Amino acid sequence: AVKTLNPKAEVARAQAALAVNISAARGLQDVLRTNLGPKGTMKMLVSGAGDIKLTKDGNVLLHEMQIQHPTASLIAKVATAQDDITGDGTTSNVLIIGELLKQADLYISEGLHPRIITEGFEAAKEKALQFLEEVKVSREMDRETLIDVARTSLRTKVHAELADVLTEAVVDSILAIKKQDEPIDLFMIEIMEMKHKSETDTSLIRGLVLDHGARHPDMKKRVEDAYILTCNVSLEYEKTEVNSGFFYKSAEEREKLVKAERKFIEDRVKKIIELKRKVCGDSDKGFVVINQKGIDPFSLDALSKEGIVALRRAKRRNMERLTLACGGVALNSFDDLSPDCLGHAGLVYEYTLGEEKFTFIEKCNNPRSVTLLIKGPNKHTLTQIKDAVRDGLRAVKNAIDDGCVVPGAGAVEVAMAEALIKHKPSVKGRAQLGVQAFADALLIIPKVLAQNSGFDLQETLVKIQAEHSESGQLVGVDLNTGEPMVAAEVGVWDNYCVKKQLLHSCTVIATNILLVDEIMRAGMS
Amino acid sequence: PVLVLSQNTKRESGRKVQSGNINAAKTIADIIRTCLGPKSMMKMLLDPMGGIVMTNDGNAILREIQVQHPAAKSMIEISRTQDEEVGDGTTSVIILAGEMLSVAEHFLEQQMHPTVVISAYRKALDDMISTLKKISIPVDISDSDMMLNIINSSITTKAISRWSSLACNIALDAVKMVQFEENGRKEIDIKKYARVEKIPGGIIEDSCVLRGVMINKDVTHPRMRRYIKNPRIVLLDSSLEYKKGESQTDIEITREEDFTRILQMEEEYIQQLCEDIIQLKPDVVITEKGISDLAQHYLMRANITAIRRVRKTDNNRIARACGARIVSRPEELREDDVGTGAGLLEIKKIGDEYFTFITDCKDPKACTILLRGASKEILSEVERNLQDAMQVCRNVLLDPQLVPGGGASEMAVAHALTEKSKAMTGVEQWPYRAVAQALEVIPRTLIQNCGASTIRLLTSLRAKHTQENCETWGVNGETGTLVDMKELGIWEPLAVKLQTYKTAVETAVLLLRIDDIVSGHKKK
Amino acid sequence: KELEEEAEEEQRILQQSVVKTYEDMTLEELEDHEDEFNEEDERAIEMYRRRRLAEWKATKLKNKFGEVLEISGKDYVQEVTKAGEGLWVILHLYKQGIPLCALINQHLSGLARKFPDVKFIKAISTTCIPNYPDRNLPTIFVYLEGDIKAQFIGPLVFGGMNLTRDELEWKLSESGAIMTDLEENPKKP
Amino acid sequence: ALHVPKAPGFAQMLKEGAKHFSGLEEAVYRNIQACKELAQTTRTAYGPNGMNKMVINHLEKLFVTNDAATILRELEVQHPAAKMIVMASHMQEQEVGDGTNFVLVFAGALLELAEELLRIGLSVSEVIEGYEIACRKAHEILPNLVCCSAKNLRDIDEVSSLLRTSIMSKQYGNEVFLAKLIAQACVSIFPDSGHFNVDNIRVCKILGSGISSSSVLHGMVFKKETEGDVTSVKDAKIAVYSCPFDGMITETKGTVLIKTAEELMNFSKGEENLMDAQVKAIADTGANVVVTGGKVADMALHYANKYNIMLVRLNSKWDLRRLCKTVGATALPRLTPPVLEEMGHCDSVYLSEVGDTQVVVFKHEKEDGAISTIVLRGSTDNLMDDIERAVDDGVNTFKVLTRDKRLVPGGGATEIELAKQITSYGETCPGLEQYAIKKFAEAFEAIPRALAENSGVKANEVISKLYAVHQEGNKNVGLDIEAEVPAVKDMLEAGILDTYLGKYWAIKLATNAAVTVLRVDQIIMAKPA
Ligand SMILES: Nc1ncnc2c1ncn2[C@@H]1O[C@H](COP(=O)(O)OP(=O)(O)O)[C@@H](O)[C@H]1O
Ligand SMILES: Nc1ncnc2c1ncn2[C@@H]1O[C@H](COP(=O)(O)OP(=O)(O)O)[C@@H](O)[C@H]1O
Ligand SMILES: Nc1ncnc2c1ncn2[C@@H]1O[C@H](COP(=O)(O)OP(=O)(O)O)[C@@H](O)[C@H]1O
Ligand SMILES: [Mg+2]
Ligand SMILES: [Mg+2]
Ligand SMILES: [Mg+2]
User: What is the H or E stretch that residue B386 is in?
Assistant: First the structure.
C-alpha cells in the first residue's frame, strides 16, 4: 500500500507477484529451451548498429535478448555468474529455474503455501546432492576422457567436423600444464583472431601469435634460429620529468645539444647491441627484441643496421606468455644483461593479412604457453568459435581439477529423480509433495533432449524410466533414435562441478523467488 | 496582485492534519507488516538505477522508498536510526510506532489535548524500560554455545537461516577477531576492520571467514613469486616512482652532459629508494600508489613481491592483520614497521580474476569473509544478514543481558505496566493502558504471519501470562503455538529491545506534538 | 576524504554527474588508475593514449608565450595585426590609474601564466592611441586576427572594484577565446 | 472484443523496437526472400554483357560500374541475411579478387532451391547435410576439370592472353589494350623469387585523351611540383630524407640565450653558414635530386638552387617508402650526406605537363625497378575509376595465377560440367539427402543462364544445348557471346578461362554462406538506431 504515499508507484501483491514471476520464468524457459543439446537451433541476433551475432549459448543469448523484466534480469545474472565460475551449463540452468517455478505454482494454485514447497525443495536438494556424490565415476584423466568431454561440449556448441577439430585443438592446448598439484592457469592459453581461410583451418600454434610486426622496412621478415629478448624498458624518447629546457647561443650548440639529448637512448640501445654481438653474431642466428613500451625510429634504425628484429608495444600478458614459452626472462632494466636472459625459438616469422601483420613464434623446445589461432571467413564465425573454445577449455579444466565426471544425456537427472521419488515417502510432512515437484523439475533436462530431436516427450521419457528398471544403469536419451542409451559406454560425459552448481544455484534462486510476495517500484521521485 | 505570504505557500491546520500524520505513519507501518517473524516473506524492490533489492529487513525496504509526506519521511529516518544504532529491530520499532500513533488518534478525537498523551507516553516508556530491565537474564560471554544460540536467534528470521549453523560461526569468528584493546582503556569493536566481499558463483556454504585479509589485486610482475610461505610485509603509502614536486623548478640546460645526467639522476634516485627498502630484508611490499618499472626491477632482484595500488581501507586492514605499520618515507622504514606473523601469502585465481590472500596470520585483528554464493542479489542479502548477526554479537558482547523473544517480553512488560496503572488514578491512565495494549501488536503480528487465528491464541496467551512468573512465555511462530521460550530457546539482547521501545515512543511523541503544516517556499 | 570503500566510491561517482566511463581523462588519472581498465581492449586504450599524447605535444608546441609582453605604439601594428595565424591577442590599454589598471595588471600576469597559449599584450593609452579619452580607464580590445572580437571599455562592464581572480577568464572567453576549466556565468556572485 | 492482447510470455516482455521472428515460415523463408532479392539486384551485371550500374552513396558520390563488390559495398543493406551474403562476397574478393558476383548468384540459387526443398517436406538438417556432401563432392572433382595450366608468367603475349579473359568481364570493347598494359606492368615487377606483390602496381589518373592514350612507366608519377628552380635532371643520384629539409631542432623546447652584442651579430651568420655547409656536404657527393618528407626551409631551398639540386617535396609515408623501393635508396633521419650504398639511382627525373597536371616523374629507362606505374588517361573521373577497377581485377588475377597456375574453361562450361557430374553422383546415391545433391546441378545452372540472360538469348535453349553437347564428353564447350542466336563453342581454343583457385574459393564461400544462413531459425532484431 504505497500508492497512497507514492502515487506513481508500481505494486504487485502476493498472487500478482507469484503470477508475474512464473510467467516471466516460463517465457525465458520457452525461449531458451529451443537450443539445448547438440540438436538445438542457432539464433541470429542483431544489435542497434547492425552487427550479426550467431549464437547458441544460454548466457550470450540471454544477454542479447531484448527484455526488461526484473526476474528475467535476476535469472540472467544467476546464469552469467554460473557461466563465469563453472564455464557452462547456462541454458539448462534457465530451464531448471522455469521448471521449478512452474511446478511450484502448479502445487500452490491448488490452495497451498510456498513455505512447504520450499522445505520440500531443500530436502530434495540434500538428497540429490547425496545421489550425485554417490553416482560420479572417478578415473585417471587421460587423453581419451578429455577428448570425450571436450567433444561433448563442442558438439553442443557447433557442428560435427568443426566440433571435432576444435576438440582436438582444445585438449592439446589445455594439456600442457605445470605440476599436478599446481592449479591450472588459463590465461596462458590465449586466443587469436584472423579473418582468414575456412573455419576448419583453426588450429593450435605452439609458440605465440602477435598482432604487431616489425615496424622498420629493412628488418628481416623471417629468422630461423632466434634468441629472444623480452623487455619492459622504453627506447622511446623519455623527456625529463621536471619541466626541463635547453638554452644555447648558436647553431653549433644546437647540434651538440641534439646529439647530447639522443645520447641516453643511444647508450641504452648500444647495451642491447653489445649483448647480441657478445651472445652470437654467427651462422645466421637471429635476434628478436620484444618490448612492451614504444621504440623510436632512431633506435629502430640503429637496431636494424645490426640485423635485428624488434617488436614494440606488446601486451602485458604477452611478456609472461613469452617467458613461459620461449624460456627467457622478463627485463625491466638493462643494468645486468646476461646471456641467460634470452629465450630460444626455432622459427620466428611474419605473415600479412590485408594491412595487418602477425608475428609467429614456434618450434620451442617445450612450450608452457600455447596459442589458439582461429581463422574464419566472417566475424560472427570467429565470435562463435571463440565462445565454443572458451566453453570447451573451461569444461576440460573442470574435468582435470577434480578427477570425476558424470554421465551425460540426462541419464544422471533421470536416475536422481528416481532416487528422489524413492526417498519421497521419508520426508515426514506435507513437504514431500514439494519434493515430488523437485523431482519432476529435473525431468525438464532429459525431456527437452527428446523434444529437440523430434520425439514425443512422454513416450521416450517413460521408456527411459522403463530402462531404469532392475537393469539399473545410468541410461539417457539417444538423440539419433530415441531408444534409451547407456551414457558411459558411448562416452557422453559432463562435468560434476557443473551439476553441483546447478543443483545449488537453481534451488536457491527458485526458493528466493517463491518467497517473493510483493514487487515494488518506488523512490524514483 | 496583493499578497502577504508567497503565492505558492500552502497552509494546513486543525485536527485534519493530525489525522493525516497518524495515517501517514500507519501507511508506513502497513508496507512491511508482513516481513516480521521467522515465517517472513521476501520483497523485491526496483531501484531507479536499474538494480534489484530482494530483501526482508524493514530498513532495506524503506531506504528505497521516497515519500513526499513529511511524517513518512520522519518514519523512514527512524528506520535508518534503528538500523544504524543497533542493527536489529527495524520492523519491530516501526510497527510499534505505527500502532502507538494509531491508538493515540482515538484519544485525539475524544477532545483530549496531545500534551497529556505525550506525558503519558513518556511515563509508559520509562516504566517499560524499567520492567524490561527487570526480567532480563545474564549471558556468559566465555560460553561459545550461548553465543551461537544468540546469533541463531538473531538469524532465524532471514534468508540465510537454512545455513544458520554455518553463518553464526562466521559472525562469531569475525566479532571475536576484531575485539581489540586500544591504548590502555577503550576496548573497541569496529566493522571497518571486518570486510565482507562477494564473489558470485559457487556454493553458499563454501563461504568462510579467512584468518587474515583478502583483496582483489595481482602481482605487479610475472616473475615475482605468487606463493610466499612466511612473508615479511612492508606497507607503503607514498609512490615508488619519480615525481616533479610542488614548487616550479624549470631546470635550465646549457652543457652537453646535463640531460643524460638528469635522467641518470632519476634512475639513481629510484635505485636508492629501492635499496633503502631492500636493506631491511622484506618479502612482500604493499603500496597505495604506483610502482615504477625500475622500482619493481630493483625489488625483484631482491626477491620481493610487489602489489601495486591498494585502496587505503584495504591497506589499513592489512596493517591491522599482519601487525605491520604504514610508512610513507622509505628511508625511515623501521624494523618494528615490518609485518611478521602472516602465515601465508597466496595469489590464487577465482573464476577469471586474481585474488591475493594474506591468510594464516597469527592473532589477527582484521578479517575478510570469502562470501561465495549464486548471484549478486543473493550475496547482498547474505551479507546483510551477516551484518545483522555481527551487530547482534557486538551488542551482546558489550551488554551481557538478555530478554525473551517471540513477543514474550513485550506481553510481559505490557501486563506489568497494566497492573501498575490499575492502581493510579487520573486522566492519564487511559493513554497509559493504550500504550500497554499497544506493545501487544508484535505477538499478534507473529500469530498473523504464521497463519493461525490471533483472537483465541492471543487471548489464551494474555490470560495465562498473568500468574506464576510466566513472563518468559511467548508464541512459537513456526508452529503458531504458545510455548515457554526457555524450551524453545530464543533470546534477544536487551539493548535491541530497549532501543526499539525508546525509538518507537519518541517517534510517537514527535509526530503527535504537531498540528500545523506550511508547505512550499524558498529554502531560506 | 578517501576513507571510502568500493561501494562508497561507486556511489560517489554515480552521484557526481553520471560516470567517468573510462574515456575522458588526461595523462594523469588514466595513468594512475592503470588497473581498473579491463585487459580485453588494450589496443583501444593504447590508441587513445597515443592520440592524447599527440594532442599534448601539439598543445605544448604552441604554448610558448607564458607572460604578458608590453609594447608601445611603434610595434603595436605588428602585435595587433601580424601576431600570427590562428592567434588572438588581449591588448589591455592601461594607465597609472590605481584601481582597475592595478587589479587587471595583477590578474593578467596570472592568466598569462596559466594560459601560455594566448598572447597577452598591454600598452599605455598615451603612446598607443593618439589622445585617448582616458575616462574609460580599462580597455581590453581583443583582436581575433586583426579585426574586432570583443571590447571592454567601462569599469561598469567589469563591475568595478569587485573583480576576483578568475572571472576575467570567463569575461575574455565568452567572445570565443580558449575554453575554460570553470563553470557558472558570473563566477557565482 | 475489439483488441487482441499480446501473448503472455516472451511476446509481452519484448522491447519497443525489437522484432522476434521464430519458426521456419517466419524466419527462414524471409531470409531466403531477402537473399534472392539481393542476388537479383546484381544478376544483371554478370558477364561480358553486364550493364554498368550507377549508385549514389550516402555522401552523393556517383559510382558507375559493374563490379559486384563495389556496388554491393557502396549500397546500404539493412537485412541480416543479405549482410551475410555481402560479407561472403567481400571475403571472396579479398581472398582471390574475383567471384563476388559468382558468390552472389550461387548463394541466391542455393537459398531459393533450399526454400523449394523445405516446401516439399525436407528438414533443415537434411538439406544442410546434403549441401555439405555435394560441396565436398564438387571440391573433390574440381581438379579433374582443369586444362591449359599457365606455363611461363614471363612472356608478354602469354600473360596478356591469360589476363584478357579476366578483363573482358568489364569493358567488353577495349579488351586487348588493357590486357597488354596490365601484362607489361605485371611482368616488370615479378621479382623472379616467387613473391609477387600487388601493391607495387600503382595507377596514376590523368584527365584528358581517351583510353588508347594510357601508358605504363617503370617508375612513379606524383601530382606535385618541384620546390626549387631546376627541372629535368638527366641521370640523377637521388637522396631520400624522412626529416624536413631544415636545420634539425631539439625535441625539448630550446630558447637561445644572447648576452653580448657579438652573439647577436653572429647568430644569423652562423646558422646560415651551418646550413650552407650541410647543403654543400650533401651536394658534393654527386647528388642531383633531394626528396624530403616534410617542410622545406627558404634558406635550404636557396642553397638547393645555388648548387643546382632538384628538390621534390613529399607528403605521404607510403609515397616515400615506395619511392625508396623504386629508386633503391633508403630514408635517413638526418641530413648526413649519404654513404655510397644508400644513394638512389634513377635514369631521369622530370617535371612534365600532360593534361594541365604538373607531375614529377622518376622514370627508369632500363625496365629495372621494383615498382611500375600505370598512367591511364580518360575523359571522365568515373570512366577512369572503372578502368582502375578493371586493372585491379587483372592484377589480382595475375597474383592468383602466380600460385596454382591451373585454369578451368569459362563461359559456363565448367559450371555445367560440374553440375552434370554432381547430379550423376546424386542419382548414384541413396538416402533422403539425395534431393539436396540434385539441387546443386540446378544451382550451377544459375551461372550460365545469367550469362544468356544478359546476352539477349534464351536461357533454356542454351542450357539444353549445353547438356546436349556435354553428354558426348567434350567438357570444354560453353556459351558463345554475340552470335544473335543461343549457340555454344569451345573455350580451350577461345582463351576464355578462369583460375582454378578462384572458382574453388568462390564455390566454397558460397556454400558456406548458404549453409550458415540456412542454419539459423530465430531472429531477434533490436531497435535499429
Ligand atoms: N551426443 C549427445 N547425445 C545426447 N546428449 C548429449 C550429447 N551431448 C550433450 N548432451 C547433453 O545435452 C546437454 C547439453 O547442454 P548445454 O546445451 O551444453 O547446456 P548449456 O547451454 O546450459 O551449457 C548436456 O546436459 C548433455 O548431457
Ligand atoms: N521461532 C520463533 N518463534 C516465535 N517468534 C520468533 C521466533 N524467532 C524470532 N522470533 C521473534 O521475531 C522477532 C524477529 O523479527 P525480525 O524480522 O528480526 O524483526 P526486525 O526486522 O525488526 O529485526 C524477534 O522479536 C523474536 O522475538
Ligand atoms: N568472352 C567471353 N565469352 C563467354 N563468357 C565469358 C567471356 N568472358 C568472360 N566470360 C564469363 O563471364 C563471367 C564474368 O563474371 P564476373 O563478372 O567476372 O564475376 P565476378 O564479378 O564475381 O568476378 C565469367 O564467369 C566468365 O566465365
Ligand atoms: Mg556446453
Ligand atoms: Mg532480527
Ligand atoms: Mg567479375
Answer: helix B376-398
